[PDB]
Design a protein around this ligand. Sequence first.
Ligand SMILES: Nc1ncnc2c1ncn2[C@@H]1O[C@H](CSCC[C@H](N)C(=O)O)[C@@H](O)[C@H]1O
Ligand SMILES: Nc1ncnc2c1ncn2[C@@H]1O[C@H](CSCC[C@H](N)C(=O)O)[C@@H](O)[C@H]1O
Ligand SMILES: [Mg+2]
Lengths: 62, 190, 204, 204, 55
Amino acid sequence: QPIKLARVTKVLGRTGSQGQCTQVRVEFMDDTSRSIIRNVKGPVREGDVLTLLESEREARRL
Amino acid sequence: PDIKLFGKWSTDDVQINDISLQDYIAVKEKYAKYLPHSAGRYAAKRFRKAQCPIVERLTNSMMMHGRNNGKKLMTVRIVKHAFEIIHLLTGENPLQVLVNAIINSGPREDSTRIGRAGTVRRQAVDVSPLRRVNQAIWLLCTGAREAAFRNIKTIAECLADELINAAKGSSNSYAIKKKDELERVAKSNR
Amino acid sequence: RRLIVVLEGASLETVKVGKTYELLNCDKHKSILLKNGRDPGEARPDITHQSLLMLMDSPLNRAGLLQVYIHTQKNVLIEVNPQTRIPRTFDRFCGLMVQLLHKLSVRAADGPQKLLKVIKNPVSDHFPVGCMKVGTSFSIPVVSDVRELVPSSDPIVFVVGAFAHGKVSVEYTEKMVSISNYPLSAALTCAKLTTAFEEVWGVI
Amino acid sequence: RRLIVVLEGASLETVKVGKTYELLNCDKHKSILLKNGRDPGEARPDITHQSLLMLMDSPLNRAGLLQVYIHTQKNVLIEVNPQTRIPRTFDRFCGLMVQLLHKLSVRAADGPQKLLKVIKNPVSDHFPVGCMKVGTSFSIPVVSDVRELVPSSDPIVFVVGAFAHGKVSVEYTEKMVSISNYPLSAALTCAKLTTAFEEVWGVI
Amino acid sequence: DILKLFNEFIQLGSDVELICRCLFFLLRIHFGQITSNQMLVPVIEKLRETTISKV
RNA sequence: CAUGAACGAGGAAUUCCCAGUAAGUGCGGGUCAUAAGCUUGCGUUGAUUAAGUCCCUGCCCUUUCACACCGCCCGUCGC
Ligand SMILES: Nc1ncnc2c1ncn2[C@@H]1O[C@H](CSCC[C@H](N)C(=O)O)[C@@H](O)[C@H]1O
Ligand SMILES: Nc1ncnc2c1ncn2[C@@H]1O[C@H](CSCC[C@H](N)C(=O)O)[C@@H](O)[C@H]1O
Ligand SMILES: [Mg+2]
């Protein structure tokens, strides 16, 4: 699976067990007009670029 | 005029190959300085240390453990000597080597922790670019510190070899092994 | 390549009687064990004592391919120098444990090297990174032969309990094995692991 | 077929102190051993103890293909029942042995079947017919693969010294072998010899 | 699946205000991804007639 | 002048700490209490991480008229 780059569109909040993780919404740099929800560790703000090794996983899935 | 680090290392030829880390590594024309000693206040506000030049960040991070606290001129001299050694051994711009080492040493995915008394359970998560840069600098400094300890080898030499190996991508460096193990743990429990 | 042996749940703790400090033994300290309602017959340093003799004289330890770790019941971790000469007879072994558990380290009599030392928990911090970690129990239905589990060039961790009853259950092990269709002792278990590794790795 | 293992140089005897009868230990009995100028450290009843534990608990013994005989330094021969259980602790084992040399036999606590009893000199006569005798020492320059020496369906005698120092030498052994190039304990020697006979006789 | 069910909830005529509030929020946040997919072309066609007529 | 002991980073656990802060270094005073087997001032050099949640351990409260939003916490024992 190719490595993907994503841009942070909305910072949703602090989740995880201890609040350490951050739920954000990200959109791919590809012209696919897609957007998913991801968990980030560390200080993250609007406009940041994330490297996804596997882009298929969803943070909030049954 | 042209601004060169230590009066001899240019910054125009230095380029960053990672799009994500372009906004968090301050080496370009506006952040080009003659010395990594500016007496600034970069910890005053959140996200402000991304505006600190990366050489000054390395100099700040090399003031450990304790026996080196507050001695910044010594660390500046160490960094200057390490850059000279890097240029002698490889023949390229030491700034480019430092940038490549920081790019390669940064983990891309980490693992979050849900822990009780019995066992701790484990999940994979992503890493923000600022934490990537911070952890890369920390790993490089720790590797140099542990390599120089109780050994006949100057801390500047060990730092030079750590940067050379990390920019090379070789597994001989401490930071590369730590990043690989963290990424393997994150991958194994997706 | 090295063999890492973890002795889990060792019964190593000190009690005081009269004016004297000595290791807690079931038979010797029967009276005081019934005091406080402590379960009699749990003070068994001998399983710990017997296993060490089995490991420390092994030809694998002779060639320098063994390192032994002891994790006692009271959450104390002990590292064993391969150069150490274990006290063969039980009482001087008991004196050794009391001295180590009090002074936190043991120096060699004729050498400057430290032989025994109490170190920081957990034991998983001290393993070589990425190594194989295997636990041994008779409870596993499938009997595994030791020799095909032996890595060709990598270190490996084997976990054996130092107790008569119960099951080994610790966090860092990832596959759990049975290697005989009989209940065996730890001393035999430490014996039958080390000889099979010796023939695989060319130690004869 | 059956494995026969014989223990020689066993330091087993009982000595009177005060009014009591005790198994002779260097540990417990420094002062008396220093009396009469007899050598300290020669009395090693412990070596016999653990060596039994590896022998008795071995699966082949539980498979029932194992008999053990002991020659003391006192030239006393004692049999052991396959269903005999050895005390894990040293002194409880010494609890039996003092009762041995006086009472000359041990019935089971749950029946008149004889767990222990002194047999007659020589033990060579008690050997099954058509059985070949192998003595073991480190000093033999050539190392033999143990799996080679096995008879397919025949009894075979192994003679393992229970002594501290010296070399095994008795008349009726036909040949000498070595199984390692390292100076080995009789304890693991018993474990190693039992180990190789496990596979060739198909007991797992 | 939700868009198909939301078409059912409007046409029966029950709880129009909350569903339309839910419906319009999803369309905005997924505007680009919806437009690319041609499978959704029949779905919005029924929504287009149903929603404006009922409101 | 001579000799050159333990000590190679300190277990089980436990305490404290968010910017001129942690830590290193020097120079003064003894002020109607305390302090000199010590306390208290003043300067010099000067960082890493973090700027948000209630998951654990706790604490403090609450559940009777612009436009827009929203549309009644539950039970027991007494009198
Ligand atoms: N047949 C066998 N195969 C593998 N391990 C065994 C074994 N027999 C005993 N052990 C190990 O030796 C240790 C002491 S034997 C104590 C009995 C243990 N509870 C049991 O399962 O039998 C135990 O930790 C057990 O893991
Ligand atoms: N390398 C080896 N090969 C075979 N037997 C060995 C051995 N090393 C020690 N042993 C046996 O272990 C027992 C105790 S060692 C006692 C000394 C003995 N004479 C010796 O040669 O070392 C002896 O009976 C001896 O036969
Ligand atoms: Mg809370």
